[PDB]
């Protein structure tokens, strides 16, 4: 075997280059204004004072915040980032093959793992000892060869995040599931419908009739004193979000810790 | 390979009921 040093092919296979984490963008995961507009096919949002359509700056803003919402509704790291953690010694888990659970998951790869004292490395574990479980967020060592805890004894550096899926309809444990993309889209779309619901009719109108010289024109709109113009669409989007979240909260597990 | 990402119905009178 030959490999780039930390990335032992069995225990810590390389999944991404540290150059690519700066090159990946939201558009590479398919989150783009065009996708939102596709879900709003046959609708256009434009300023009634000017006819100007809504700018892609707003779409990208909403998309980035929707990504943040998805990254907090589930205890996951969606976008690749380098994580540096200082973790505590605990006797039970240290005896349990040096078990540590990362704060962020999935793990793309582990970059460094050391035992240290006042920042001095006391030991540097050989990379061939590192065992990584990517979707779980678990790291262990399997060596080839006065108190129960102490603070910040373990120094851990790793890359968290998810890669874009390589094939249609499929994902590896380190690849974003196809439906989490749709969840983020639904979160963005739920905001866009709230914007659009103000512009179907003049402000604050639920009904109008206008008649001139016996020509009569009359409208009942979807607005009402209770429900906004986009009420039904938002309700449906919330149902879809509920189904998607149930599915994804089955894919990622329940959080647990041993006291 | 790559993931896909971006009549007739008539009204008429009942004439028998008109006769009635």
């Amino acid at each position: 075997l030959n490999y780039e040093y930390p990335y032992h092919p069995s225990g810590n296979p390389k999944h991404i280059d540290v150059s690519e984490i700066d090159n990946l963008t939201l558009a590479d995961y398919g989150w783009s204004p065009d996708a939102v507009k596709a879900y709003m096919f046959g609708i256009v949002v434009q300023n009634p004072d000017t006819g100007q359509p809504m700018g892609d700056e707003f779409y990208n803003h909403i998309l980035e915040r929707a990504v943040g919402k998805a990254e907090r509704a589930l205890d996951i790291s969606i976008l690749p980032d380098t994580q540096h953690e200082m973790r505590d010694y605990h006797e039970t888990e240290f005896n349990s093959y040096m078990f540590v659970h990362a704060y962020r998951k999935p793990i793309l790869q582990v970059e460094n793992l050391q035992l240290q004292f006042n920042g001095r490395p006391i030991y540097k574990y050989p990379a061939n000892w590192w065992k990584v479980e990517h979707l779980a967020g678990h790291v262990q060592l399997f060596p080839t060869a006065g108190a129960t805890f102490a603070p910040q004894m373990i120094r851990l550096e790793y890359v968290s995040g998810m890669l874009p899926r390589k094939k249609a309809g499929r994902n590896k444990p380190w690849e974003m599931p196809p439906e989490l993309e749709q969840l983020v889209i639904k979160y963005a779309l739920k905001e866009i419908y709230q914007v659009w619901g103000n512009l179907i009719i003049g402000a604050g109108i639920a009904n109008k009739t206008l008649e001139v010289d016996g020509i009569t024109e009359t409208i009942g709109t979807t607005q009402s004193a209770m429900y906004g113009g986009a009420s039904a669409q938002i309700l449906q989007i919330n149902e879809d979000i509920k189904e998607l979240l149930d599915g994804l909260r089955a894919y990622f597990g329940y959080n647990m810790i041993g006291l | 390979e790559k993931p896909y990402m971006i009549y007739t119905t008539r009204l008429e009178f009942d004439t028998i009921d008109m006769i009635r």
Binding site: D75, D88, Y103, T148, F149, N255, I257, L259 | -
Partner: protein, 56 residues
Amino acid sequence: SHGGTTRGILQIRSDQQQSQHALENFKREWKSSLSGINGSWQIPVVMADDIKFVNM
């Protein structure tokens, strides 16, 4: 040699589960206050929506 000696499960429940980070620093709040002889007679106060302990 092989068994689960685990006394029980402490079920804490709220609108959503804590993140792993939150839960691990809650474990630090716990152990720094309650573990061993040093913590032995202190009682935690917790304000979760409901707390249950399941005897196994």
